[PDB]
Amino acid sequence: ECESGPCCRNCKFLKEGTICKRARGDDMDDYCNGKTCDCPRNPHKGPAT
């Protein structure tokens, strides 16, 4: 969350799909879920950013 905007995992953005943390199993990356870019893509166990 370089600032708080999504699509910038760590201020650079990956490519829409950077799941926060694959809770369901582990964790992937961090994609812009349309809210932020700090692992906003971990709709697993109970993640989601």
Side-chain angles (χ1 to χ4, degrees):
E1 68 116 71
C2 192
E3 65 209 89
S4 159
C7 255
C8 72
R9 21 155 177 156
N10 31 235
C11 210
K12 245 191 112 126
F13 178 42
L14 206 300
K15 69 211 289 261
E16 279 185 55
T18 0
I19 144 238
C20 154
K21 301 133 98 179
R22 177 37 61 104
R24 271 172 303 191
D26 296 301
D27 87 292
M28 289 297 156
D29 315 283
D30 304 344
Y31 111 100
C32 77
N33 94 64
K35 233 256 176 245
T36 180
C37 64
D38 213 349
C39 94
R41 189 165 249 272
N42 43 150
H44 339 331
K45 287 233 133 147
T49 268

